[PDB]
Write a protein that binds this ligand. Structure first.
Ligand SMILES: *[C@@H]1O[C@H](CO)[C@@H](O[C@@H]2O[C@H](CO)[C@@H](O[C@@H]3O[C@H](CO[C@@H]4O[C@H](CO)[C@@H](O)[C@H](O)[C@@H]4O)[C@@H](O)[C@H](O)[C@@H]3O[C@@H]3O[C@H](CO)[C@@H](O)[C@H](O)[C@@H]3O[C@@H]3O[C@H](CO)[C@@H](O)[C@H](O)[C@@H]3O[C@@H]3O[C@H](CO)[C@@H](O)[C@H](O)[C@@H]3O)[C@H](O)[C@H]2NC(C)=O)[C@H](O)[C@H]1NC(C)=O
Ligand SMILES: *[C@@H]1O[C@H](CO)[C@@H](O)[C@H](O)[C@H]1NC(C)=O
Lengths: 134, 59, 300
């Protein structure tokens, strides 16, 4: 088994929390840097990916760290966002984070694919005539 | 004197007094006109270089 | 409409791609078979600044000096600036070299050999099956009902953000890519693409397919419909647009030449369109088109 923590360590006044609203994770807690550490939940190792974005517009990006036990999935909202926010701010839709944990052994029940945040940010819309949107 | 890529010479007079250059029409595949001139002009720097590039998200 | 194929004997037989070829012959094309494992050049695409063949389709080879002898990169560029059409594919077991440098020079990046995609949520664990709710574009093939296309071991590509890229099919949202190591090295998620297209100025089209066993005789039951539709889109047989003459005049009958325009008055503007489905020109109906009256800066 393992436990995994998460935290943005942002550079602004944003990301109010919502929460989550088969092989389910138990819960998530907030210690309010600004760690959003969950409790243990596991199915299998060898695949681990955090997906930030939205699939209605087919736009997302993937973060794959590990410090293994416990995991760290830090998500900087200053440098590691390029044009996802500029789509997210026009039409107000909550961007999502989703956890992938699986492997090849034939345990269909023991697979994990479920979003565990529904966050909503407001830093700035801030079009700088960045053409590469539409 | 380095070479230019986006223009090309069309007429140049007898005692080199008037020189007339013409804008080169845009590239038919989206490539920047500096990169195609560097590709043609320098047939050296051959390599394998199997590494993934750093791209933004296709939006 | 002379085509020209390129096949390698060592990897696949040529009769394995049979039922899509000669139906391709049925609407008055003419083929030209051409080996790569027989040492004689005999292929001059351009003769005395005249291009000979209209089309090229290739088949996956294991690199080699033979393909670099037949057609290097600069004949693909000078062939493709003069409205020639290309259907090309690759494989995870064998990625050629000049094809990869040609496509990286265009603006799409296919993954090299050894990298292979896989999915741990698919209902079959041997092949890789993609459902028919991933199709991005609509004017190339529109899925009528739910289907399941079968690939084999296959590669993915990741591309730039230009005006001319036309992506057709996508990866599943829970996919990744592995080399001999253990990560998601090349692409990961639904940012890898498996059938992409490319149009350009002086309209000419090419398509890249990221899988070998997509046009096999043995697999013809599952995806017979999709393959025929790509083979129509690539060869400029569907979705082409012609423009009728555009006029403008005064509100009344008088033309611009007889009374040139004053600072303000009433004009109109009209245009007309046409679409070719292979046999006749038919009217094309689209809800939105737009008119711009600009000096350096749009006014209207
Ligand atoms: C000598 O030579 C000079 C150089 O060749 C000539 O100078 C040029 O003049 C023109 C107009 O005289 C200038 O165009 C201006 O640009 C300003 C500046 O805006 C800013 O521009 C910079 C780039 O310079 C840009 O980076 C910024 O983002 C910012 O936009 C602009 O505010 C003006 O409005 C106009 O810009 C446009 O005008 C055209 C139509 O004129 C439109 O396509 C466009 O939408 C835009 O705004 C319009 O405004 C009109 C009235 O102002 C209005 O009729 C339109 O409907 C339209 O939009 C409006 O916007 C307002 C508020 O936003 C709303 O209330 C309204 O409802 C509606 O939405 C040009 O920049 C300048 N060039 C240079 C290099 O300086 C000079 O004319 C010449 N001398 C002579 C001939 O005597
Ligand atoms: C293909 O190439 C190999 C390598 O030279 C050669 O030995 C073989 O005879 C060729 N032909 C076939 C049908 O394999």
């Amino acid at each position: 088994q393992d436990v995994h923590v998460s935290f943005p360590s942002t550079a602004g006044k944003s990301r109010v929390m919502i929460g989550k609203v088969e092989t389910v994770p138990t819960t998530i807690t907030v210690e309010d840097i600004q760690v959003n550490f969950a409790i243990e939940s596991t199915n299998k190792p060898f695949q681990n990916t955090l997906l930030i974005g939205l699939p209605n517009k087919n736009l997302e990006m993937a973060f794959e760290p590990e410090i293994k036990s416990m995991y760290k999935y830090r998500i900087d909202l200053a440098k590691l966002d390029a044009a996802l926010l500029q789509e997210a701010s026009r039409s107000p839709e909550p961007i999502k984070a989703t956890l992938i944990l699986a492997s090849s052994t034939a345990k269909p029940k023991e697979n994990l694919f479920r979003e565990i945040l529904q966050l909503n940010l407001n830093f700035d819309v801030d079009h700088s005539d960045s053409s590469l949107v539409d | 004197v380095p070479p230019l890529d986006y223009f090309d010479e069309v007429f140049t007079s007898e005692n080199w007094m008037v020189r007339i250059y013409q804008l080169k029409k845009d590239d038919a595949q989206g490539r920047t006109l500096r990169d195609v001139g560097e590709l043609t002009r320098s047939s050296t720097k051959t390599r394998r270089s199997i590494k993934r590039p750093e791209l933004g998200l296709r939006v | 409409s002379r085509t020209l194929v390129l096949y390698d004997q060592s990897t696949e037989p040529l009769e394995e791609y049979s039922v899509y070829l000669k139906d391709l012959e049925q609407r008055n094309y003419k083929l030209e078979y051409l080996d790569i494992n027989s040492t004689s050049t005999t292929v001059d695409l351009y003769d005395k600044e005249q291009r000979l063949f209209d089309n090229i389709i290739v088949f996956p080879t294991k690199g080699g000096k033979n393909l670099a002898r037949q057609i290097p990169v600069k004949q693909l560029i000078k062939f493709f600036e003069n409205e020639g059409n290309i259907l090309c594919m690759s494989s995870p077991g064998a990625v050629p070299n000049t094809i990869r440098l040609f496509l990286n020079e265009l603006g799409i990046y296919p993954s090299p050999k050894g990298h292979v995609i896989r999915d741990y949520f698919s209902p079959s664990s041997e092949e890789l099956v993609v459902s028919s709710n991933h199709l991005l574009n609509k004017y190339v093939y529109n899925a009528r009902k739910s289907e399941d296309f079968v690939f084999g071991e296959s590669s993915a590509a990741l591309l730039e953000n230009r005006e001319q890229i036309v992506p057709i099919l996508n990866a599943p949202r829970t996919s990744f890519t592995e080399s001999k190591g253990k990560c998601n090295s090349w692409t990961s998620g639904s940012q890898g693409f498996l059938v992409v297209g490319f149009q350009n100025l002086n309209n000419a089209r090419l398509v890249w397919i990221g899988s070998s066993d997509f046009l096999k005789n043995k697999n013809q039951d599952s995806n017979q419909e999709f393959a025929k539709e790509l083979l129509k889109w690539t060869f400029n047989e569907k979705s082409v647009i012609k423009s009728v003459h555009a006029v403008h005049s005064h509100a009344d009958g008088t033309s611009y030449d007889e009374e040139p325009y004053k600072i303000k008055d009433k004009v109109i503007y009209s245009v007309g369109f046409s679409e070719w489905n292979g046999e006749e020109w038919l009217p094309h109906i689209a809800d939105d088109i737009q008119f711009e009256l600009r000096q350096v800066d749009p006014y209207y």
